[PDB]
Amino acid sequence: SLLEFGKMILEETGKLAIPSYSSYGCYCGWGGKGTPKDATDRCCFVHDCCYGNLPDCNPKSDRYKYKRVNGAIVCEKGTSCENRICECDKAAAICFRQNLNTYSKKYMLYPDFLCKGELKC
Numbered sequence: 068s069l070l071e072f073g074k075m076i077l078e079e080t081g082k083l084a085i086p087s088y089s090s091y092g093c094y095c096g097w098g099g100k101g102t103p104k105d106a107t108d109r110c111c112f113v114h115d116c117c118y119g120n121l122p123d124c125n126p127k128s129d130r131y132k133y134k135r136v137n138g139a140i141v142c143e144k145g146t147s148c149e150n151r152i153c154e155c156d157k158a159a160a161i162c163f164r165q166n167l168n169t170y171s172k173k174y175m176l177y178p179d180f181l182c183k184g185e186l187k188c
């Protein structure tokens with residue numbers, strides 16, 4: 068759920084999910100349209116696609132458990148949905164940490180109208 072996702076993000080990047088990653092670019096948070104603006108936005112795009120692979124799952128509200136082993140995120144065994152949701156979120160948290168150097172404040176609260184084009188999953 069967003070509670071676990073939020074905590075991963077803070078742990079990885081030291082930034083709070085709201086508001087650093089909930090209104091960023093074309094894909095982070097609510098949105099989903101056009102071309103991702105930068106690496107961080109691509110992480111959100113792939114994250115949206117990952118959830119999109121799980122029709123019959125409720126990734127926003129379904130809670131999973133994860134632990135840290137040697138600093139590494141390890142998803143603990145739950146239902147099938149919980150496992151797969153945790154793996155999507157884990158990948159996004161790492162992707163954010165990997166692209167932290169290029170995170171730009173310029174893309175915070177980005178315009179909807181400037182999210183143009185198309186990109187399939």
Ligand SMILES: COc1ccc2cc3[n+](cc2c1OC)CCc1cc2c(cc1-3)OCO2
Pocket residue numbers: 069073084085088089094095096097111114
């Ligand atoms: C139902 O309300 C919603 C709806 C959608 C929400 C989406 C997100 N958050 C709260 C939401 C929320 O609650 C305030 C919090 C953090 C976050 C980090 C993210 C992200 C999406 C979100 O994509 C990449 O990184």
